[PDB]
Amino acid sequence: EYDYLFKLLLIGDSGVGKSCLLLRFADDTYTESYISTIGVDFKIRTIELDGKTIKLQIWDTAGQERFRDITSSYYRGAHGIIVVYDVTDQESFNNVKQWLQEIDRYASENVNKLLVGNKCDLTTKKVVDYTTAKEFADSLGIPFLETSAKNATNVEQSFMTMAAEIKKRMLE
């Protein structure tokens, strides 16, 4: 059982590692093989926060951003949305603004937001500096972390940070 159930969604440009982030967190696996669908709509991981048991239900886009678009209902039912970009791809960071506008168009009014810059292991290809993305996130009052699904860097922390934000909003 659990004290709380939080529904999370990862959004962002195709191929930034959203599915790899989910699979690393929920299953502790990583592959470079191409992923269209993960065989389920969501994965589950149960965490502990402040002595409370929190079931996290984390939904995958099923690659719908590859050739079409994310449906509005996927936005509306989330308690928190993680916007992911690829630190080696300037365009994916530029498009974070558009993903935030989609959240404003379709998500719940009080949804929690978190910015993640993934593939932080690719040091020689990195083009979005930590300071650039942190300044942007700070300007919106949204938390920000850099992650590596491949090396597991900050992946658990990213989901724990989102859970902490949601719990704080729920208790207020």
Q: Does 15 bind ligand GDP (CB under 6 A)?
A: yes
Q: Does 19 bind Mg ion (CB under 5 A)?
A: yes
Q: What are the φ and ψ backbone dihedral angles of 12, each rounded to 5 degrees?
A: 145, 170
Q: What is the separation, in whole angstroms, between the first and last Cα of the chain?
A: 23
The Cα 61–Cα 86 span in angstroms is 16
From the list 11, 17, 103, 107, which residue makes contact with ligand GDP (rule: CB under 6 A)? 17
Residue 13 exposure: Cα atoms within 13 Å on the Cβ side? 17
Q: Least distance (Å) from Mg ion to the CB of residue 153?
A: 19
Query: Which is nearest to 46 in space by CA: 163, 167, 172?
Result: 163
Closer to ligand GDP at the Cβ: 122 or 164? Answer: 122
- The verdict on whether residue 15 carries a ligand-binding annotation is yes
Q: Least distance (Å) from ligand GDP to the CB of residue 3?
A: 30
Contact set with ligand GDP (CB under 6 A): 14-20, 32, 34-35, 118-119, 121-122, 148-150
